[PDB]
Amino acid sequence: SSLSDQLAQVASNNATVALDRKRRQKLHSASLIYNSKTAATQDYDFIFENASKALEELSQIEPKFAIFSRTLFSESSISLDRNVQTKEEIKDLDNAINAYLLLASSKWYLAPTLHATEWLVRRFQIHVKNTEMLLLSTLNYYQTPVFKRILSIIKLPPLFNCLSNFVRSEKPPTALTMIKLFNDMDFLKLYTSYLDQCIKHNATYTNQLLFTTCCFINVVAFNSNNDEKLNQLVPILLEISAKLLASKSKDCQIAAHTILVVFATALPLKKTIILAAMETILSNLDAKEAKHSALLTICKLFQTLKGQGNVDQLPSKIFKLFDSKFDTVSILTFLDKEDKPVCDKFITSYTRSIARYDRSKLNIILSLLKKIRLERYEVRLIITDLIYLSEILEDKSQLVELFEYFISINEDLVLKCLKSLGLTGELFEIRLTTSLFT
Amino acid sequence: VKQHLQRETQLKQVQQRMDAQRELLKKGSKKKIVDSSGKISFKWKKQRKR
Amino acid sequence: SLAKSPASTIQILGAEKALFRALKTKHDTPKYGLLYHASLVGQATGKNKGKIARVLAAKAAVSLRYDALAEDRDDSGDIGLESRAKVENRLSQLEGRDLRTT
Amino acid sequence: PNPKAFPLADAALTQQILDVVQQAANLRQLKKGANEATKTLNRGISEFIIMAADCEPIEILLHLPLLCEDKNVPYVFVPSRVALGRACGVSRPVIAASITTNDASAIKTQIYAVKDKIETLLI
Amino acid sequence: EDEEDIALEFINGEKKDKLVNMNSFTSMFDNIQNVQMDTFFDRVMKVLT
Amino acid sequence: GKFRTILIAVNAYGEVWEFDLNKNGHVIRRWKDQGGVGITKIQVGGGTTTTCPALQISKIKQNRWLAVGSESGFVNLYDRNNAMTSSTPTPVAALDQLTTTISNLQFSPDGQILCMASRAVKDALRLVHLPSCSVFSNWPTSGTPLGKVTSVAFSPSGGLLAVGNEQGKVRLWKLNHY
Amino acid sequence: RIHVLKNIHRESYGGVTQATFLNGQPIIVTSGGDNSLKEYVFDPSLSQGSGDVVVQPPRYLRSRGGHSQPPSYIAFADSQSHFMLSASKDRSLWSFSLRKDAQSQEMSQRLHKKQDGGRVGGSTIKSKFPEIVALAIENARIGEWENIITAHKDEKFARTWDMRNKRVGRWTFDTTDDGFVKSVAMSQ
Amino acid sequence: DESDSNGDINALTKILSTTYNYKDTLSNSKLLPPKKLDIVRL
């Protein structure tokens, strides 16, 4: 390698060290508020007073900010220099900085956040040393001028290279630039680690979740014509969807619902994966908007399926979990809803699962089949299952009522089902102990 | 008034010739058709503008 | 008369001096006229100002012909609102495009 | 169709109009769009005007009959703007087309026949 | 009946669905400011359906 | 064991007649192609067609799809189940991928593919997935030797596609799904 | 699961028979029954703060190889007995050094652009040439133009190769009577 | 840290751990997929 390349590595290692007056000036002029002229003349005490006032206001707004007054915004931190610390002490300081940035991500629209983050910018050089966490925490605000100020004073990591032309520019980054930023796989791994930390520490909020959901959905849409890129996108996005579903936050759950719906529409997934995602959706479901989104998600996920086991009944555990979460009258009023997204595959699988397991809501099966319009293959599968159930079950009444309904609508399909099963219509009349045929 | 009419029709013929050449400059498949009288015409292919 | 004028006239209305000196001296014509003071053209930047002027002149011609020639009109400006929505879609597309390489 | 759309032609006249429009499209004797039809009416270089009766709202088209009555130019209504656009030879629907004037045009006889058939409607 | 006739019933069963292309959700960035997550989900479902 | 034969005839305007050949050729119905100018081709698909016939009377099925192809390069695609009622029906899709006259319309025996082709220019063949009504992207390709496509045939069973062109070549492809 | 490297070794000869991480190194040495010995290395992460979460996939470092099937044909490439040419039934033509095994290299089958400017043709899923049944090599014009002719099994043309570049050349020599190539020869 | 030794939230994580190919191809779905075609020249 070149001597110049090795010296470049040396310079990158000793970037923040103020080895003389000019380096001190260049490092200290970087600020989120003041210009370079004022910033060079300011000392640490003045910035510390303003940052302590800002942290007092931040603690009055959010009480969790008061824990940082003993560790980062204390009076002892004025004389703490990073470069004379060891690696363990720098690691502890980095953990504290990460926790502060995670907590301060939501409040960046407030004025005290900027004045309090001045102290971390100027004492602890986070725009040089904690750059990635700063960008990931403030990445939602790319319209706003505070992100412009961060971009102006910041250095860029390797993973943030789509923003290289938006440094020191009046025009903000665009939505296409953010999509191109997210479209990298390693950036997605870094961002899913960040979201894992946010979900683990309960720091997710609505503007963040809307931004990440829109970016993930647009990444899926951009990769929709490459099946290899989509196949690589399966683990990252489905792990982060599982983690968002594990959250207690209904906004996190709705974000995971959106990701699952778009991603299932873009890529035809295995039925095992669809059923496992449905189990994960149904497991931690406790809020009303989450239920409303989750039912539509389940209907769309089942409408996606096109394999041989397409219309097959649910497994017993998943069916009982669905029955516990979503109730019969809720299914009925979901069909009464005027919007009514296409859900015939899920409704038919639900009907066959009811006939397999419950054995007591055959009139509910009748009501569902009256309210939804099913296709011939689905009706044929339902009719065959009901014929088997008529052979098994001792009581015929709940089933025979369904069978006059099936004579009323598509009688010839019932005849062909009986012929396929080897039964004559009069033999089925003997089975039902009632004459139902013309 | 008659001279105004003559200038107007002369400018009309000039503009028609310019517009014919400006249509040749564009994008399409065209065929040169030479009449027996000697007039030069161009006929375009039956193709729809994308 | 403003309804019977086409959209290309409505774009350059008020810039007749520059328009006709350019048309008489074989120079470049104005990109816009009185419509430079509409709010949407102001939101446009750079080369997108002429594009938004062209789009807005076309939609203004549509809305203004409707506004003059309709026998039955509800005085709500719904045609104007739909055309404004279309112009805002076009403006958002033009502004979201960037020229520097990422 | 809208009552303001007048004169609307029948199926056979619509056939002949759209055939002549296709021939003019192949010969580059056609102007597409209400703005360009307005320009040809102003400049006096239009044979006749074809307008699509299913334009919504129709008042985008309705300024053209006034200009046609002023400059004494025949105009006609055909039912479908999709049909008019496909005859004009473009991938977009077209609500107004203008047949321009050319004496050396090979389709002059067809243009003048359809023009007379349109004028009988305007009588 | 035949298994071919049953397969034809499946094939006539499948109906039209909207597909995802690259410029399907680019306009969603305009309105992520004040709206809620359920409203975003409704917009996404409207695009997909 | 009983079926009826319907003749579906289209003129250049777009008006479509349907005759019942069993009832002395009297007219069942008449309707109009939406958009509809310069129509060259009409073709049903998804059931027993003249391209793919039945091997017995019980195998006769109705056709789900109808396609109308014009001089402009437009193909209007009608779903018959909804289009038999309107007498001025709306197409499910209008395809403008080709810019020259539609001279070949064909369907797969299942009707999942519509093959539309033009003999006017080279390499003017497109395969359309139904019911999504979407053109396949990866095929045909810039290096596909279609030529000036004058004739198209679909195999009844094998899933083969035979394309005959102006150089006299008939090239053959197999769809691996079939 | 960090990563999956698919088909680094052929399934028929036994797949990955041995793979060993070297001690303290981000280098794994792999081998299989197909006469290959490869190495893969892990680059350092592109993230500074994240690190262990964001892991780049392993990349190919270096390998040694040979024929996977017995050689169909051999020849000596020069008078110094430095190098041999060997074509095998696994459709590979190799150059093997008698002086140092590192200098052995597989002749590249990447085609050239046609002189007229037309497209070459053939399947986009690229496969190797049919097995070579005959070979002729003359080093009188090595470095100037093609100096190897090979006759391949069940083909009606012969292929030329350049030994200086170690790659297939730009001419295919036809039989012009609709027959398979049985013999090749070259002038001195 | 760990030894391996009524819905569960870990179902998706476990199925992602198990399967390596996520797209469904062995089902023989007999409905033709929309945008990509499997076609070979004879």
UniProtKB/Swiss-Prot annotation, chain A:
It is found in: Nucleus, Nucleolus; Mitochondrion. This is U3 small nucleolar RNA-associated protein 10. The lineage of its organism: Eukaryota, Fungi, Dikarya, Ascomycota, Saccharomycotina. Present with 18200 molecules/cell in log phase SD medium. Belongs to the HEATR1/UTP10 family. The modification N-acetylserine is found at S1. Involved in nucleolar processing of pre-18S ribosomal RNA. Required for optimal pre-ribosomal RNA transcription by RNA polymerase I together with a subset of U3 proteins required for transcription (t-UTPs). Involved in ribosome biosynthesis. Interacts with snoRNA U3. Interacts with MPP10. Component of the ribosomal small subunit (SSU) processome composed of at least 40 protein subunits and snoRNA U3. In the absence of snoRNA3, forms a complex with other t-UTPs. This complex can associate with pre-18S ribosomal RNAs.
UniProtKB/Swiss-Prot annotation, chain C:
It is found in: Nucleus, Nucleolus. Residues 1-96 form the Nop domain. Interacts with SIK1/NOP56 and NOP1. Interacts with the trimethylguanosine synthase TGS1. Component of the ribosomal small subunit (SSU) processome composed of at least 40 protein subunits and snoRNA U3. Belongs to the NOP5/NOP56 family. Present with 34700 molecules/cell in log phase SD medium. Required for pre-18S rRNA processing. May bind microtubules. This is Nucleolar protein 58. It comes from Saccharomyces cerevisiae (strain ATCC 204508 / S288c). The gene is NOP58. The chain holds residues 308 to 409 of 511 of the full protein.
Swiss-Prot record, chain F:
It comes from the Eukaryota. WD repeats lie at residues 47-88, 97-138, 144-177. It is found in: Nucleus, Nucleolus. Belongs to the WD repeat UTP18 family. Present with 9570 molecules/cell in log phase SD medium. Interacts with snoRNA U3. Interacts with MPP10, UTP21 and UTP25. Component of the ribosomal small subunit (SSU) processome composed of at least 40 protein subunits and snoRNA U3. Involved in nucleolar processing of pre-18S ribosomal RNA and ribosome assembly. This is U3 small nucleolar RNA-associated protein 18. The chain holds residues 417 to 594 of 594 of the full protein.
Swiss-Prot record, chain G:
The gene is UTP21. This is U3 small nucleolar RNA-associated protein 21. The WD repeats are grouped into two tandem seven-bladed beta-propeller regions. WD repeats lie at residues 13-65, 72-106, 133-172. It comes from Saccharomyces cerevisiae (strain ATCC 204508 / S288c) (Baker's yeast). It comes from the Eukaryota. The chain holds residues 283 to 470 of 939 of the full protein. Interacts with snoRNA U3. Interacts with MPP10. Interacts (via WD repeats) with UTP18. Component of the ribosomal small subunit (SSU) processome composed of at least 40 protein subunits and snoRNA U3. Present with 2020 molecules/cell in log phase SD medium. Involved in nucleolar processing of pre-18S ribosomal RNA and ribosome assembly. It is found in: Nucleus, Nucleolus.
